[PDB]
Amino acid sequence: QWALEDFEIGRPLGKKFGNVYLAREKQSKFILALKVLFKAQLEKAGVEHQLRREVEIQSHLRHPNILRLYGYFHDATRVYLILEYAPLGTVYRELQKLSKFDEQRTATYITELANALSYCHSKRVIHRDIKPENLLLGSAGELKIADFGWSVHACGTLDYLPPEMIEGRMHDEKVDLWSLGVLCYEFLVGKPPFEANTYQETYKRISRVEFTFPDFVTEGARDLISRLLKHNPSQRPMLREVLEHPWITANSSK
């Protein structure tokens, strides 16, 4: 039902796995994002099925703060994904430019994130790879979760991975609550709470939950973060109370 013939390619949006390009559905004049994946990478990495997994998960997943996947197709040498175009780019790019985020922006992003995750959890879908470069911004500054590569229904940088996952133990939906704490930290500080020059160092800093707060962090923020960043998953608060946390309720937008 789809072919490269149907699309006019444009500006390179970014990104190994394969590049992402701005494109236009010729008949519809609809502008979207097109990621080209070379099956060569699919072979050597054995991600031939992982794609077939996520492409089913995301394709029938509809939420304002989740980047939509409209469809997919393949030729001889490449695989193409037709994704929603996020005009305001990534949050990672935003964070680079502004170094740090204010509490309104942070609580707003965290709010939009939680809402999208609850929905995912409703369909019993866990994301795990919630990272600034996987968070896009829509036309209205809308936060939009992207990339469901490791999304399932129950190795690079370890910064956003929870203790139970890096130790090999069993991981539930509380994984995303860990990441949510990591982001709120990085959104406020500009750096992840467990950063290191070493995979091995970050491993220990994560596993022992060793994070320190700079002075400009509000106690209202120090609370939520330290509540989301707990070694025992069962102690991580529910997504509902996150959205009901006073610091969130105060600084988040409407």
Ligand SMILES: O=[S+](=O)Oc1cccc(-c2c[nH]c3ncnc(N4CCOCC4)c23)c1
């Ligand atoms: O793993 S795949 O889903 O590929 C991805 C992973 C994350 C976002 C992504 C999307 C989706 N829509 C987009 N509009 C504008 N830039 C995008 N970017 C930022 C710059 O880098 C390349 C993607 C982008 C594609």
